[PDB]
Amino acid sequence: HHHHMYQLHVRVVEAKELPKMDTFGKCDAFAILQLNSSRNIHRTKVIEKTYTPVWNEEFHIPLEDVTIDTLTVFLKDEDKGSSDDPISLIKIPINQFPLGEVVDKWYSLIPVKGVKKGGQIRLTIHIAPLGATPFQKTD
């Protein structure tokens, strides 16, 4: 290639202020990550029965065009006797992240229709050139 080929490294750290998504429980949250409308989707594990889940899971997503790519983060509640319940989502433009910076930030999610509040999610995001160590700060 005659241009840089960037990688999106994302740590899904934790969430807070989640809504009650179960009549007899609290929330069993997991997060789904999707670049643009890609068929490669990533999902975290489920953290049962808490409004403040901690996942600390890392994902590595090749980028097509840092000037236009978007990362959608979608929170859902796992259920056992019914289908999972959508909670909230945020679409994050990749072009807002300085190349090579490790950015650790909280994000407000937008609740889906019918959900009272969307929560916040903490993501550590690092746009780095191909081969660079994920989450390694610039030197």
Q: Which residues bind Cl ion (CB under 5 A)?
A: 19-20, 98-99, 116
Of 27 and 33, nearer to Cl ion (C-beta) is: 27
79's contact among Cl ion, Ca ion, none, with CB below 5 to 8 A by partner kind, is: Ca ion
Of Ca ion, Cl ion, none, which one sits near residue 85, judging by CB under 5 to 8 A according to partner kind?
Ca ion
Residue 69 CA to residue 42 CA, distance in Å, equals 16
Calpha distance 28→51 (Å, rounded): 8
Report the nearest approach of Ca ion to the CB of residue 117 (Å).
Answer: 15
The strand ranges marked E within the chain are: 6-16, 29-35, 41-43, 54-62, 70-77, 85-93, 102-108, 110-111, 120-129
Shortest spacing between CB 121 and Ca ion, in angstroms: 17
From Cl ion, Ca ion, none, which one binds at residue 28 (CB under 5 to 8 Å depending on kind)?
Answer: Ca ion
